[PDB]
Design goal:
Radius of gyration of chain A: 4 Å
Shape of chain B: globular
Strand content of chain B: over 45%
Radius of gyration of chain B: 18 Å
Number of domains of chain B: 1
Order of helices and strands of chain B: EEEEEHEEEEHEEEEE
Distance between the termini of chain B: 40 Å
Number of helices of chain B: 2
Number of helices of chain A: 0
Number of strands of chain B: 14
Strand content of chain A: under 5%
Structural class of chain A: little secondary structure
Oligomer: heterodimer
Helix content of chain A: under 10%
């Protein structure tokens, strides 16, 4: 979820 | 070199990660990294994360265009608020798909260059470079200022992940607030990672 961990 | 400066310019290009449909990105070039002049930081329309792409060398960046329209500096609305915002620990509230709350513990880093009504910020649960117009969210109450409170820029960097392999990168920026905190560009990714190096 969101952007890149 | 480049012989013309695209910092502050609007760019657009295709994104060619494969033989399927090719998305078209628009964005504002925020900075050219002093320690690597080929690396640009870009605010793309529709992305909450600042992107680092070697815009003229990457093969994923197809048919790159620089628009004549520069983005002017929209001068600071609430300077002192904006300036006392920088460096504080914050609670950022987003609505999810459902519309329920989603609160994220983060730190405001600095005023974004070029897009001067925007603030660099990163989050505990996602230590990459985000970009938001934080004044609105503060007056809306979606942002809470919490009361809790030798530059190695230009050196190569290595990490060891679970498999135990080098993740090569470079240090590209230091935050003037919190100089122990730095921006890192790994070769394998376009996200700007935010680490506290001088931590012990």
């Amino acid at each position: 979820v969101r952007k890149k961990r | 070199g480049s012989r013309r400066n695209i910092v502050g310019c609007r760019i657009q290009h295709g994104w060619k990660e494969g033989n399927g449909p090719v998305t078209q990105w628009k964005g504002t070039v925020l900075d050219q990294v002093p320690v690597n002049p080929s690396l640009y930081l870009i605010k793309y329309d529709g992305f909450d994360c600042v992107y680092g792409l070697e815009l003229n060398k990457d093969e994923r960046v197809s048919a790159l265009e620089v628009l004549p329209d520069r983005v002017a500096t929209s001068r600071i609305s609430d300077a002192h608020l904006a300036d006392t915002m920088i460096g504080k620990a914050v609670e950022h509230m987003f609505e999810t798909e459902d519309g329920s709350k989603d609160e994220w513990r983060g730190m405001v880093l600095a005023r974004a260059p070029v897009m001067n009504t925007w603030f660099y910020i990163t989050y505990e649960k996602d230590p990459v470079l985000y970009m938001y117009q934080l004044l609105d969210d503060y007056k809306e109450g979606d942002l809470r200022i919490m009361p809790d409170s030798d530059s190695l820029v230009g050196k190569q960097v290595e990490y060891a992940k679970e498999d135990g392999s080098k993740r090569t990168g470079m240090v590209i920026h230091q935050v003037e607030a919190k100089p122990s905190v730095y921006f890192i560009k790994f070769d394998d990714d376009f996200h700007i990672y935010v680490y506290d190096l001088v931590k012990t």
